[PDB]
Amino acid sequence: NITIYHNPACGTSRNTLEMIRNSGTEPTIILYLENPPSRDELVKLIADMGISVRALLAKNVEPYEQLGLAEDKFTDDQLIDFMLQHPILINRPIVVTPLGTRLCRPSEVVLDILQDAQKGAFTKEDGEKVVDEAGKRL
Numbered sequence: 001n002i003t004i005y006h007n008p009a010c011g012t013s014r015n016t017l018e019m020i021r022n023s024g025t026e027p028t029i030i031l032y033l034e035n036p037p038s039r040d041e042l043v044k045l046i047a048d049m050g051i052s053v054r055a056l057l058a059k060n061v062e063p064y065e066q067l068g069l070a071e072d073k074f075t076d077d078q079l080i081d082f083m084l085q086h087p088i089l090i091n092r093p094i095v096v097t098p099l100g101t102r103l104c105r106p107s108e109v110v111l112d113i114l115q116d117a118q119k120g121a122f123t124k125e126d127g128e129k130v131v132d133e134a135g136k137r138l
């Protein structure tokens, strides 16, 4: 039982999703821009990902720029509430499996939490080889 918080317009998210599939399971796909996590759920995700609230913020998106979030003037809960109100601020993708939750940047981080091994070689969109046919990480 796997969930991905996916943005189809993001290569890292696309690569991650295909690596999930290459492990033999079709995840539940949450288009977080339209269906963001509830506050409780977002707090849980951050906790399980073991990163700071700020480390989850997507830079170079309009609200990050306009709300001045680069500046160290925001408590964690201020940042959580901005992410809820402006889901494009949630960096991508977040993946949940029975083993754990990760912000999969770079995409191959997802290999940590996938239970089943890649079923064969995996090469990212741009041609970057990730695992060979034998299953070794390159």
Ligand SMILES: [Cs+]
Pocket (backbone or CB within 6 Å): 035, 036, 037, 038
């Ligand atoms: Cs929700």
Ligand SMILES: [Cs+]
Pocket (backbone or CB within 6 Å): 062
């Ligand atoms: Cs806008």
Ligand SMILES: [Cs+]
Pocket (backbone or CB within 6 Å): 111, 112, 113, 114, 115
């Ligand atoms: Cs693993």
Ligand SMILES: [Cs+]
Pocket (backbone or CB within 6 Å): 118, 119, 120, 121, 133, 134, 135
């Ligand atoms: Cs393999």
Ligand SMILES: [Cs+]
Pocket (backbone or CB within 6 Å): 011, 126
């Ligand atoms: Cs790339």
